[PDB]
Paper text:
The nicotine oxidoreductase NicA2 is a crucial enzyme for the first step of nicotine degradation in Pseudomonas putida S16 (DSM 28022). NicA2 from P. putida S16, 6HLNO and 6HDNO from A. nicotinovorans, and the nicotine oxidase NOX from Pseudomonas sp. strain HZN6 (21) belong to the family of flavin-dependent amine oxidases. In the NicA1- or NicA2-catalyzed reaction, flavin adenine dinucleotide (FAD) is required as a cofactor to couple the oxidation of nicotine with the reduction of oxygen to hydrogen peroxide.
Using this structure as a search model for molecular replacement, we then determined the crystal structure of the NicA2(21–482)–FAD–nicotine ternary complex at 2.25 Å resolution. In both structures, there are two complexes in each asymmetric unit. The nicotine molecule is bound midway between the S1 and S2 subdomains, with its pyrrolidine ring facing the FAD-binding domain. Unlike other, related structures, NicA2 does not have an associated diacyl glycerophospholipid, wraps its substrate more tightly, and has an intriguing exit passage in which nine bulky amino acid residues occlude the release of its toxic product, pseudooxynicotine (PN). Only when the surface of NicA2 was set as transparent could the molecule nicotine be located deep inside the active-site pocket. We hypothesized that the molecular deceleration via the severely restricted product exit tunnel strongly hinders the release of the reaction product PN from NicA2. Our results indicate that the passage in wild-type NicA2 effectively controls the rate of PN release and thus prevents its rapid intracellular accumulation.
Author numbering: 49 to 482
The structure:
């Protein structure tokens, strides 16, 4: 349109990027997508362990999540139900390492009590969860951490350990740092209702894996897709942009959509400088230091669930599969990488054995999202005061647009939020290229 190599370049092949490329490709724009890694998905990654398909990152979807569910209808993708109902064993590991077996009914009842107390005012604070700063109350609450509220709730020891564990997981961090409104807003997105919100958590996966939806969008898009091309700089010039790759290739474009994780912006030079509000976000970054671990054990433990509080590593434990022949594959999410050397098998083994004494570890598979230069962190987790400034992160900068789950209004800790932001970006591109 103005002599550039491309109409639009999308940086990042996660869901935010795939969605944006799809929106732009179908408009008939000459569209390029650049991905730093040699694989697609970003903070979703479909892989294999002990002869079965697994998800190392984002995995779970629901019909109460509007953007991803519509995409699933478009591409004809069904759901797979993970065995999260009628549990056999439910455990809590407290800060000091002691393990308590709770009866599954009681376990469920207690986390319910604690969660409903934590999110008691979600309807008044977030009557419009897709406009987070609609009410003044949402703004004033952003002066508080989740821990500040937790301390006022009068929870039992069990209740407090369960909820702190849950929030540690959501934060990818200790709960003193974790912003209170973010959590409320999410609960609000799931119809301000415990049962509804829980059904969205870790229940339904995408049939064919996350990679299937990514491929379906990129295949639909007609965009050129380049793998193993990290972007190192963006300069605004001649009514478009010059994009520099790590090999010192220069690609010109009318517009660029940045979809990279917030914590990775420091790897990219911008000319001119981004706005001060945006520089603040980039220097703070996003909290989460999460990692993902699968352990195969010989013993058949059936359907298990465990919380560990934030001072212990194995914070969220769930059964991926079980049988007498298989044994059990445990799906474990770790809130803070620092709490466990996830690539040291002797350490992982001892930790698993602390949780389940007398278990025999047949194999492990891990993904350390904090060591990966193209994530440098896990899922989006807002610190105190970040949510109320979110517009700084979203705002167009001349011909640079921004997307990614961090920048979404709704389900910011989810695939759905990435999709949302990609739809926004597609629209902002059209407006610029119109
Ligand atoms: C361990 C883990 C588990 C999760 N589980 C769930 C879940 O169960 N359900 C759920 O809904 N959500 C989950 N999430 C979050 C969910 O994955 C995100 O909300 C969403 O998928 C992120 O999409 P994105 O496109 O914004 O980011 P990303 O997926 O991170 O995409 C960013 C892309 O940019 C690329 N990139 C980075 N730097 C450059 C560069 N310089 N040049 C080019 N490309 C670059 C990256 O390689 C990556 O492909 C999870 C996240 C993690 C980390
Ligand atoms: C999908 N969520 C939102 C942020 C935490 C993340 C999550 C929840 C349960 C398990 N593993 C990861």
């Amino acid at each position: 349109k103005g002599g550039f190599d491309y109409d639009v370049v999308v940086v990042g092949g996660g869901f935010a990027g795939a969605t944006a490329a799809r929106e732009c490709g179908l408009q008939g724009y000459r569209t390029l997508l650049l991905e730093a890694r040699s694989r697609l998905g970003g903070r979703t990654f479909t892989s294999r362990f002990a002869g079965q398909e697994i998800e190392f990152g984002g995995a779970w979807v629901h019909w109460l999540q509007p953007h991803v569910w519509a995409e699933m209808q478009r591409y004809g993708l069904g759901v797979v139900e993970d065995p999260l109902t009628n549990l056999d064993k439910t455990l809590i590991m407290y800060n000091d390492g002691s393990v308590e077996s709770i009866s599954p009914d009681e376990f469920g009842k207690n986390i319910r009590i604690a969660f409903e107390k934590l999110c008691h005012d979600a309807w008044e604070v977030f009557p419009r969860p897709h406009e987070p700063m609609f009410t003044e109350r949402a703004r004033e609450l952003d002066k508080s951490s989740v821990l500040d509220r937790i301390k006022t709730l009068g929870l039992s020891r069990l209740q407090q350990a369960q909820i702190n564990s849950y929030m540690a997981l959501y934060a990818g961090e200790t709960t003193d740092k974790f912003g209170l409104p973010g959590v409320l807003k999410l609960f609000a997105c799931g119809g301000w209702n415990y049962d509804a919100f829980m059904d969205t958590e870790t229940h339904y996966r995408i049939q064919g894996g996350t990679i299937g939806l990514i491929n379906a969008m990129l295949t639909d898009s007609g965009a050129e897709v380049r793998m193993s091309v990290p972007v190192t700089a963006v300069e605004q010039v001649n009514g478009g942009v010059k994009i520099k790759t790590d090999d010192d290739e220069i690609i010109t474009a009318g517009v660029v959509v940045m979809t990279v994780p917030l914590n990775t912006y420091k790897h990219i030079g911008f000319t001119p400088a981004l706005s001060k509000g945006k520089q603040r976000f980039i220097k703070e970054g996003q909290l989460s230091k999460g990692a993902k671990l699968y352990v195969h054990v010989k013993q058949n433990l059936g359907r298990v669930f465990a919380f560990a509080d934030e001072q212990q590593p194995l914070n969220w434990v769930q059964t991926h599969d079980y049988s007498d022949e298989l044994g059990t594959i445990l799906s474990i999410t770790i809130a803070r990488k620092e709490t466990i050397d996830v690539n040291d098998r002797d350490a992982v083994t001892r930790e698993v054995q602390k949780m389940f004494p007398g278990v025999e570890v047949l194999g492990t598979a891990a993904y350390d999202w904090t060591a990966d230069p193209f994530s440098l962190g896990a899922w989006a987790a807002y610190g105190v005061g970040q949510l109320s400034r979110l517009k700084d992160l979203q705002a167009a900068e001349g011909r640079i647009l921004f997307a990614g789950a961090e920048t979404s209004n709704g389900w910011h800790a989810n695939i759905d939020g990435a999709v949302e932001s990609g739809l926004r970006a597609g629209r902002e591109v059209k407006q610029l290229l119109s």
